[PDB]
Amino acid sequence: PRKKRPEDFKFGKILGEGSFSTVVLARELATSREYAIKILEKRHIIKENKVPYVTRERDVMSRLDHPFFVKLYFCFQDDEKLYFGLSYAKNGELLKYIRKIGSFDETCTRFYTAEIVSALEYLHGKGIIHRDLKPENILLNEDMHIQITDFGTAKVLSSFVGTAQYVSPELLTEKSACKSSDLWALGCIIYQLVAGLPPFRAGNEYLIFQKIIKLEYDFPEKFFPKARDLVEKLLVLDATKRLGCEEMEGYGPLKAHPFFESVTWENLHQQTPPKLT
Numbered sequence: 001p002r003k004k005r006p007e008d009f010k011f012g013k014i015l016g017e018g019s020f021s022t023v024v025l026a027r028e029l030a031t032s033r034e035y036a037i038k039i040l041e042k043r044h045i046i047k048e049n050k051v052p053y054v055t056r057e058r059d060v061m062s063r064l065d066h067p068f069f070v071k072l073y074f075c076f077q078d079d080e081k082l083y084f085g086l087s088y089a090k091n092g093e094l095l096k097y098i099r100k101i102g103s104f105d106e107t108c109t110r111f112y113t114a115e116i117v118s119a120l121e122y123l124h125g126k127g128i129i130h131r132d133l134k135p136e137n138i139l140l141n142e143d144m145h146i147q148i149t150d151f152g153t154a155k156v157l158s159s160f161v162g163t164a165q166y167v168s169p170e171l172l173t174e175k176s177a178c179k180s181s182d183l184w185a186l187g188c189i190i191y192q193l194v195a196g197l198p199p200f201r202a203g204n205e206y207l208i209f210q211k212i213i214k215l216e217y218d219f220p221e222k223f224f225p226k227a228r229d230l231v232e233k234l235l236v237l238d239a240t241k242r243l244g245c246e247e248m249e250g251y252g253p254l255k256a257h258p259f260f261e262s263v264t265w266e267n268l269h270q271q272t273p274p275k276l277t
């Protein structure tokens with residue numbers, strides 16, 4: 001079969017724009033199927049030496065086949081642009097819901113954290129480090145299950161510094177992320193869901209980094225006791241001592257944390273998600 005062409009689609013609303021691309025809701029006309037198409041401007045990426053970001057993106061997404069990840073279905077191109085055909089997540093970003101609801105109750109925090117843990121287990125088992133995990137790239141599909149995206153910045157085990165709020169100490173100081181770096185980000189995300197704000201906050205990127213490296217943060221008075229404990233076991237400076245990391249014997253003991261007491265891990269992706277708080 002021939003590669004798809006722009007003419008095969010009716011391009012609809014722009015979902016969002018990044019520094020090097022536009023993600024656009026599009027309908028494949030022949031089958032009426034909706035896709036999020038990521039449109040990349042070749043010149044801009046050429047001129048900014050970002051191409052590796054582009055192949056890693058295509059490569060990593062092509063090997064993702066798990067319910068909690070965005071999938072890459074096709075790729076085509078013209079002179080101007082590169083087009084990635086992606087899963088469309090109708091309900092947008094986890095971030096949107098944090099803003100809208102303010103903070104999640106325990107039921108919701110527990111459910112979504114569990115889906116994120118399950119997704120990271122899959123990813124890490126494939127030797128992939130996300131390196132930029134944040135509510136902005138944890139999407140929600142029509143059934144309100146999560147779909148993680150944004151893989152151009154991932155590391156595959158075969159100079160980058162992710163978003164300041166969620167970046168790990170080892171990436172800052174050692175210039176090297178590891179699987180465990182994503183568990184640090186998970187800690188930050190759990191904290192954000194419960195508190196409504198991320199744990200390392202300050203007036204600029206430099207000051208946020210300083211807090212990260214010194215592990216300087218506080219828990220508000222609203223914080224669920226079991227979530228407090230879990231976060232403290234994720235936000236640990238030493239990457240080999242985080243609950244869930246390989247050196248701490250993996251995902252077993254993480255999933256056994258009592259914060260997850262009432263969760264059924266088996267077919268999480270088939271369970272009905274709790275209505276957002």
Ligand SMILES: CN1CCC[C@H]1CCn1cc(C2=C(c3c[nH]c4ccccc34)C(=O)NC2=O)c2ccccc21
Pocket residue numbers: 015016017018019021022023036038070086087088089090091092093136137139149150151
């Ligand atoms: C900050 N950004 C620049 C452009 C996208 C956005 C980051 C979050 N994000 C969302 C993405 C996706 C989708 C989006 C759903 N609602 C959105 C609103 C703005 C931007 C993207 C989306 C999607 O349906 N499938 C996706 O893969 C996506 C796909 C690749 C890389 C990053 C992505």
Ligand SMILES: *SCCCC(=O)N1CCN(c2cccc(Cl)c2)CC1
Pocket residue numbers: 041042043045046050051054055058075076077082083
């Ligand atoms: S759609 C199939 C994409 C194949 C691929 O991996 N490519 C194609 C050429 N590429 C490229 C050309 C010009 C500018 C940029 Cl940023 C990328 C990417 C590699």
